[PDB]
């Protein structure tokens with residue numbers, strides 16, 4: 001068994017000549033040579049069986065990625081694990097090797113209007129498929145968008161993904177959230193559990209603003225600082241948008257704030273394409289009921305060069321699935337990864 005940075009990485013005999021890439025969500029990532037397909041691949045090592053929540057995120061992600069099949073969503077090529085549940089301690093996930101992610105790219109590269117337009121198109125095309133399967137990603141951000149050498153973009157990390165549940169979205173003021181703060185919709189800090197499609201559209205709008213200036217638009221440092229960042233640009237919500245917030249604590253918090261006027265998008269982004277700013281405005285709409293949907297965003301004049309609904313596929317059926325013990329979860333992980341074992 002090959003060793004990498006002091007730890008075991010046994011993916012052989014199919015995968016050889018390992019190179020350390022870094023650390024993933026819950027393990028080590030290496031590039032390797034796939035001796036069957038004769039290409040270099042990405043291999044993530046995961047060890048989640050001692051913790052129930054790590055078991056839940058692993059199972060969730062494996063189930064979703066194995067059912068999804070889309071050019072703008074990372075696929076699983078192979079899964080390596082022991083032949084028995086008793087011998088299984090680690091799981092190796094094999095994926096296409098990508099050149100970079102949008103986070104790394106935005107830290108050192110200025111993006112042309114053509115690249116921003118193409119990247120946005122691919123994000124929304126991938127998001128249309130996810131949403132068609134009644135799934136919410138819930139953690140869209142530049143580090144969850146992978147890019148190959150020809151700028152093909154793939155959405156990754158479905159660890160926090162859920163089946164859409166708009167009837168059970170309501171919650172109290174200051175309800176704790178798990179997703180990355182800078183890309184959280186304003187309703188999450190007010191009265192939403194993030195169970196509706198509109199929360200992903202907000203994250204995509206944040207990503208678009210970031211592609212325009214190479215800086216997060218709302219880099220809140222904490223829960224309510226995040227809201228102050230949003231309202232400092234969008235301005236105070238209207239009476240109509242407040243009336244949609246029934247929870248007294250959330251509504252009265254917004255009422256207690258001094259009036260803030262809107263900062264025009266063309267002043268924040270003077271070099272941006274005017275059509276890109278019109279779409280940005282519609283994605284970064286405070287009211288989630290008025291926020292643009294994924295299919296309307298795809299049909300926006302900014303993406304006219306790419307828009308083709310016949311070439312923007314949807315899922316063949318909606319997706320359907322944590323209060324389950326880790327022993328049952330290890331067993332479910334073992335069963336989900338069975339198709340990749342030799343005798344299949």
Ligand SMILES: Fc1ccc(-c2n[nH]cc2-c2ccnc(NC3CCCCC3)c2)cc1
Nearest residue numbers: 021022023024029042096097098099100101
């Ligand atoms: F910096 C990292 C480290 C790990 C990942 C990662 N976590 N889980 C899967 C991958 C992954 C998948 C496909 N290709 C890559 N390769 C490159 C992406 C970042 C730049 C060099 C490696 C990583 C991404 C960025």
